Amino acid sequence: MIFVNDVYKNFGSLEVLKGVTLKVNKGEVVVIIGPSGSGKSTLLRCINLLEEPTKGEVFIDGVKINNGKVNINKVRQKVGMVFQHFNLFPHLTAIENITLAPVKVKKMNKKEAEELAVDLLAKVGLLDKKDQYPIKLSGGQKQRLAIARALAMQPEVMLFDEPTSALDPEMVKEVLNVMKQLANEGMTMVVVTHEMGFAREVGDRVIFMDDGVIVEEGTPEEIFYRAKNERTREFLSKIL
């Protein structure tokens, strides 16, 4: 399903990814961790081509997508993405946020759109706020709404780029609960996070990245209790 193959990335002379490989099969929850500047978020953003690798290749469903011989909108149709700072559309109401892409991209019927939207609002527990504008949303409400919007395009994999890192602490766990619920329902997920509780509770795999490389990987228990590499132990000792 996802196959990032030996990719590298540069920004100027700054080397962020230095040869990385990642395989994700349907149903996995893969959680990527590491110190800042490890390359976590960049590798995450190669998956739906918000970055383009200087070398290496990105395959989605057996199809190379960074050869310029493929349509990227058709890719991102299947590959959802949730952002650290939400990136809600500020001029659109809650529903309208959710229904915009399905109506204009999938060409859905607008009231089939509005029923998809009202049951997603119910799902993440925002049905009381269908008509408000994002400014009158809390951080938790915002991130839950961004998730509803992402899901309305019905992807087969969801990418999460540090979705709780900009939330007040009293608000982290409602977003975490929604994501967990997605994991329990079998969604394929790649999550970059500072919240190890999530990797504990629903993670299938944990990738430890450091200085642009995957330095160690394994199951959550393997990594949190029995890490073999010395960089992993250093990082974990500082963050656990």
């Binding site: 909108n73 991102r76 590959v79 959802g80 993405m81 952002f83 990136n87 915009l100 204009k104 991209v105």
Partner: peptide, 22 residues
């Protein structure tokens, strides 16, 4: 904010649509 364009594209919208509606 460049994030707006990012959310738009990431939801499958083409540059034209991102431009018009967002």
């Amino acid at each position: 904010d460049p994030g707006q364009n990012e959310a738009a594209r990431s939801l499958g919208m083409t540059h034209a649509m991102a431009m018009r509606y967002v």
